[PDB]
Design a protein around this ligand. Structure first.
Ligand SMILES: N[C@@H](C(=O)Nc1cncc2ccccc12)c1ccc(Cl)c(Cl)c1
Ligand SMILES: N[C@@H](C(=O)Nc1cncc2ccccc12)c1ccc(Cl)c(Cl)c1
Ligand SMILES: [Cl-]
Ligand SMILES: [Cl-]
Lengths: 298, 301
């Protein structure tokens, strides 16, 4: 029993965190094979011209107490790739994946190439992440673990004026309409990740918290008209299908749970809580709920 | 900026998780140097669950009864002994991934990261606090026994908890790494209930300071209170009393924000009286009590 916000074990990623220094800027880098990936803003803007002026010896890369020899450098979008003379002996099986809004991932927050914390978060529909980051965390990565394969999905780049965070996939492409330049940028109005709220209600039913269940069902169209009104993301037929296994396990059809959600929005919680929370949680995907309520290991 | 429930990186602990099997029972073990620590109830049969005599059961066991598996390598158990409710299995190989470590016993209110494991394999990492009733509100399934709670001291891992059992309410009970249970719990199938849980008041105040550091000020007020008047209001809401030690521990946060402890205490009193009025603090509609003053300082500085 129990339901916690749970991150993937960070070991496989910790063995990849290195410190990257260029001039007065020190941030984190991801050492995979003989390549170190880090935000291109470490050279700081005309990034192509700035990188042309740089030499391999300008980049100081440190892995623990060993300095790595940079033997090449190139740029892929907003990420800098530093070729090094040594393959990371702790390189896990990995992939670079681009995630969608709603999908969750674990973040390994680092400072000076040293992992300090691991937390689970979701890529918000407005493409920001509500992370916890201080100065020096740039280069910290977001990942998922698929069987025994690390899927790198995020690299931290900056903090927006509201305190939310922005970053890129491991190919340097930003998530959202953000740029890595000191200019006024605002996150769009965020919305709630509806499929994740439904997944979290299933997790509550699995844990015995069932006060919110009602006799009602709804059509997907009627649910979406009501959800749109409360700044909730539309629920697609893909989401209904993904919630299938949880619907079968709990005996609560997706449209049946949608009518529970529909009432929770129009009426509130009435002083009651669900999984120790007075708000509807939207940072647990249907896969996270299944994984946590079935004990999948890594 | 931002405030998240943040666990310590679990790598140093993952390299210590092994699978321990004795008869039909399979749970997790912690491999440190040439010793594997695991809950002693792994040696229990079906009949010996309500009132097991662990000394008597362990005397009947031989080293060849314990199957220890570290990855795809079976470890040779060359000795066995019991320290309180923990079984110590000596093995013929020192764990090459043994980190710098200490065995620490924690107090209610203290937080720690939990590495949930199944069959000696880490599946998840989450943050926990030792509840005032000495239980932990974890997320555990059958097979999670032996999963450990830890904190990281720069390079050193302080092991503070080993999961043993789930109480009837769904909350969890366990021991320090010396086998001593936290709370009035025993590793027997006898009827056991957790006492009424209370809110870790000092942790709530630490969390309100974290909110002020993050720019949340709506809950602040012009009032101050005496420590005695705050404690009388707090107990009525099932909140732990706040001692002079807690006021002193909140000192650095009070200096950083410019809000005295008794000033924040009056804000907490007002919050308990009115509720949140549809507003949130750090994205939460409830007062969070699983961030210690030490966690808040660490995460904000
Ligand atoms: N120095 C960073 C930055 O703001 N990175 C930080 C990350 N997370 C949290 C931070 C909190 C405080 C200060 C800095 C933070 C930066 C600044 C401007 C731009 Cl346009 C870019 Cl791409 C990157
Ligand atoms: N079978 C275990 C147990 O309850 N261990 C589990 C741990 N966490 C969560 C669990 C959820 C479901 C089933 C089992 C769980 C057990 C039972 C009685 C006693 Cl007295 C002891 Cl020491 C240990
Ligand atoms: Cl699924
Ligand atoms: Cl008193």
């Amino acid at each position: 029993s129990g339901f916690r916000k749970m991150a993937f074990p960070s070991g496989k990623v910790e063995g990849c965190m290195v410190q990257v220094t260029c001039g007065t800027t020190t941030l984190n880098g991801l050492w995979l094979d003989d390549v170190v990936y880090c935000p291109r803003h470490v050279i700081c803007p005309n990034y192509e011209d700035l990188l042309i002026r740089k030499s391999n010896h300008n980049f100081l890369v440190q892995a623990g107490n060993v300095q790595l020899r940079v033997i090449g450098h190139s740029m892929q979008n907003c990420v800098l790739k530093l070729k090094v003379d040594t393959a990371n002996p702790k390189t896990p099986k990995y992939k670079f994946v681009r995630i969608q809004p709603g999908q969750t991932f674990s973040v390994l927050a680092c400072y000076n190439g040293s992992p300090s914390g691991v937390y689970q978060c979701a890529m918000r529909p407005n493409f920001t992440i509500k992370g916890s980051f201080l100065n020096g965390s740039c280069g910290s990565v977001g990942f998922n673990i698929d069987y025994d394969c690390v899927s790198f999905c995020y690299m931290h780049h900056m903090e927006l004026p509201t305190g939310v965070h922005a970053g890129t996939d491991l190919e340097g492409n930003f998530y959202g309409p953000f740029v890595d330049r000191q200019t006024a940028q605002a996150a769009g109005t965020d919305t709630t990740i509806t499929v994740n709220v439904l997944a979290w209600l299933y997790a509550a039913v699995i844990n015995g918290d069932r006060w919110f269940l009602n006799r009602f069902t709804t059509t997907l169209n009627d649910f979406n008209l009501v959800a749109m009104k409360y700044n909730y993301e539309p629920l697609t037929q893909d989401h209904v299908d993904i919630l299938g296994p949880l619907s079968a396990q709990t005996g609560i059809a997706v449209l049946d749970m949608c009518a529970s959600l529909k009432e929770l929005l129009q009426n509130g919680m009435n002083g009651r809580t669900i999984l120790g929370s007075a708000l509807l949680e939207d940072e647990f995907t249907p896969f996270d709920v299944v994984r946590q309520c079935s004990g999948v290991t890594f």
